[PDB]
Amino acid sequence: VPLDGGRFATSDLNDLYRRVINRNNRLKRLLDLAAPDIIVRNEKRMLQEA
Amino acid sequence: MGHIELASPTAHIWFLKSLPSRIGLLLDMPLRDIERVLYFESYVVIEGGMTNLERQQILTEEQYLDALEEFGDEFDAKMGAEAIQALLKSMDLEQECEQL
Amino acid sequence: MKQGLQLRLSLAMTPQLQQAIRLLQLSTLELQQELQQALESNPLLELPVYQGETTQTLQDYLMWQVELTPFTDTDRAIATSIVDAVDDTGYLTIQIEDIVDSIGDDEIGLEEVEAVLKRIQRFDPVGVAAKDLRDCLLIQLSQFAKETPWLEEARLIISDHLDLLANHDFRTLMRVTRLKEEVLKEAVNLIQSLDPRPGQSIQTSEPEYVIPDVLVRKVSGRWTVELNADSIPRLKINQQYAAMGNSARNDADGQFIRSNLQEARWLIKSLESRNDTLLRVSRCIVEQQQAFFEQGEEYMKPMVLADIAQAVEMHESTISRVTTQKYLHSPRGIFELKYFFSSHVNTEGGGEASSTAIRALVKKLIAAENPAKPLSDSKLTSMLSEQGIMVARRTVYRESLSIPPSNQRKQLV
Amino acid sequence: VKSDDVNGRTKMYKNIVDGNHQMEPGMPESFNVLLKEIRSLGINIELED
Amino acid sequence: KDLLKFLKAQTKTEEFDAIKIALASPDMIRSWSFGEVKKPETINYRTFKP
Amino acid sequence: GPEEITADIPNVGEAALSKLDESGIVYIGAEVTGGDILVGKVTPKGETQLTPEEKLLRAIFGEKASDVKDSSLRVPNGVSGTVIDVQVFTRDGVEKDKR
DNA sequence: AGGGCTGATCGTGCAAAAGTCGTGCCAGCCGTCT
DNA sequence: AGACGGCTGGCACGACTTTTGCAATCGCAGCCCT
């Protein structure tokens, strides 16, 4: 549902999913090129919260 | 619908958040202890009756390491909710329900 | 004392700084965005408007028409297949033989496909599933009553003099079709008024999308372009983010995070380079302008990018692509920083620079160009000479301005 | 009829044109939507027969 | 496809009585969804494509 | 492409333009019923290639090439009347001022 | 018991070849006027 | 009625640009190869 024609301006859970997509990316980022044991220390908590 | 693998675990926020937390009883963990486990602070002894730390017991990181030194890998202790993931993966009703 | 090229003499960015500055050479909005996503490290680097109106766009109208039209299962399937591959203008993209092949039925034949295409053409708008060109024109003419005059000659022009009118060969049309001189013009006009590309009429809504990367504003008549400051990417370092990186206490991960902070500081230099260059050089470019656009496009000359870089005075004439892949918006609209650069079009008459000014002079000449043709290379070149630029027929641009030759521009009045 | 039916809306409009007077129940889209919302949250959505 | 049954294939409904409500398994999660998401991108401002 | 009030509506009925000005405005004192065009802008669209079909279309009819899409304003549906008075405000530096 | 060799770390230029633009301007052609 | 005109652009050559295409030596000393 774009507002002014240019920007979609999505809201809420998808927007939350946006941040979750970060975590979804971060999970992939945790999957490779990050130490999941060392990373999920503060990452997994924010992951559960989000 | 799409999906996501979610390498960092995410137990259902609905699951055990309610006052009648079924998980908090199946693991029998304290509600504050459960909150710490979700907050990745509990470091509770994950499992194993052979190790000195109980299969379901809040294990200090020093205590968990000491028990690991004592009995090899028998000491398992996770701070995050994966502790609860095991605590329910281990919480058994197979003929245990009749005993209860 | 004096100087000498030979003496005991006491540099150039390599690898890491190369990709860094490339982030400036790359566009910051998207080209740098992919790399920023590819980073995947340095964790210490941070009523309701809802409306769901489902427009049909006349495709659902066609579906309701076929469903409401009396049709069999095979007839409905053929009509749906005909309606499926329709171009925007309204002419069928594929052929009837392709439709028969996609049907994959031996019983499905060219005759049934033709009947279905005629029935579809027997629906709004004129010339549905045109496939062949001017089918909209032929359908409109057939729909037009015979009481209309010049209709016979109009149909003759549309059916087989389609190339004759396409070449605007009015003399040849009169000589071949044997239509009356200066009277076949009325028939040609009647053929012209037949809703060509009527199907394109249905398509009228396109989304708006313009990214102002330096939005100069002139509602007040003049304003700082702001370099689209909010949209400018900016990573954030956080102390708690450093603490969480320490939570990633792995020594190899720690070294990785440290080197990542190093490369991220380098990239910070790159983005600052892009922004400061496209800020200072852009202020220099807008210095020629006063109160937003001063004299429209007639305000600049062939721009020396090396000159702007030497104005930045650090990578002096060390050219790059940072202002490139970045566009400044102004009262007229969005114009690139590459467009902030310019090229030499004026050739004599104290002219050696700026293609936009000469093109604007040509545009003013087109406001008074020749009627039988776009302003002839004599006409346009003489207009440019009156501007003193003297672009010559070498710039006379006419074929480049989508303007064909002179005599082909002669047409019936 | 007076609800979110799309494919039933078209069928009913065609029938009203043809004078058939028939509506097809099927299953509401909002039903599958709520099922998804269940699947969207932490619970599988599965309906038995 | 015969182009007469594939079109007819889309429109179908079951009685669907005895609707049940039960828990979840990750294999079923994989089966129900069609793909897994990893990037936070939703829509672009360059060419307006998925 | 900028949408400008030029009253140049491609693939349009002539009677609609009967009330418009060269500016595209309607002269003060007109009558209005239905969805009568009110302020007619034309939003230019993406340019086309050589496009032999579109090339032939521009050769035969031309001047539109579907380049301008209807960005026009029209009278409301179920609201009719007589135009009492008008006004306009353009961003400074834009000097259309046709009507 | 003696050698080697190793790489932790070492970022805002500018130039190379190459093109591309400026600019004109020669060959052809058809509208014309012859 | 065949040659002018001016269009055209192809044909050609210099002048501004301009992306790219180049990462290392330090630092001991210890561990590994001899």
UniProtKB/Swiss-Prot annotation, chain D:
Residues of the full protein shown: 1293 to 1341 of 1342
Subunit text: The RNAP catalytic core consists of 2 alpha, 1 beta, 1 beta' and 1 omega subunit. When a sigma factor is associated with the core the holoenzyme is formed, which can initiate transcription. The rRNA transcription and antitermination complex (rrnTAC) consists of RNAP, NusA, NusB, NusE (rpsJ), NusG, SubB, ribosomal protein S4, DNA and precursor rRNA; S4 is more flexible than other subunits. In pull-down experiments interacts with CedA.
Processing after translation: Acetylated on several lysine residues in the presence of glucose.
Family the UniProt entry places it in: Belongs to the RNA polymerase beta chain family.
Job description of the protein: DNA-dependent RNA polymerase (RNAP) catalyzes the transcription of DNA into RNA using the four ribonucleoside triphosphates as substrates.
UniProt superkingdom: Bacteria
Industrial and biotechnological uses noted in the record: Co-administration of salinamide and rifampicin or salinamide and myxopyronin suppresses the emergence of resistance to both antibiotics.
Protein name, as recorded: DNA-directed RNA polymerase subunit beta
UniProtKB/Swiss-Prot annotation, chain E:
Post-translational modification: Acetylated on several lysine residues in the presence of glucose.
Biotechnology: Co-administration of salinamide and rifampicin or salinamide and myxopyronin suppresses the emergence of resistance to both antibiotics.
Intrachain S-S bonds: none
Subunit structure: The RNAP catalytic core consists of 2 alpha, 1 beta, 1 beta' and 1 omega subunit. When a sigma factor is associated with the core the holoenzyme is formed, which can initiate transcription. The rRNA transcription and antitermination complex (rrnTAC) consists of RNAP, NusA, NusB, NusE (rpsJ), NusG, SubB, ribosomal protein S4, DNA and precursor rRNA; S4 is more flexible than other subunits.
Functional description taken from the UniProt entry: DNA-dependent RNA polymerase (RNAP) catalyzes the transcription of DNA into RNA using the four ribonucleoside triphosphates as substrates.
Similarity comment: Belongs to the RNA polymerase beta' chain family.
Protein name: DNA-directed RNA polymerase subunit beta'
Native source species: Escherichia coli (strain K12)
Gene name linked to the record: rpoC
Residues of the full protein shown: 2 to 51 of 1407
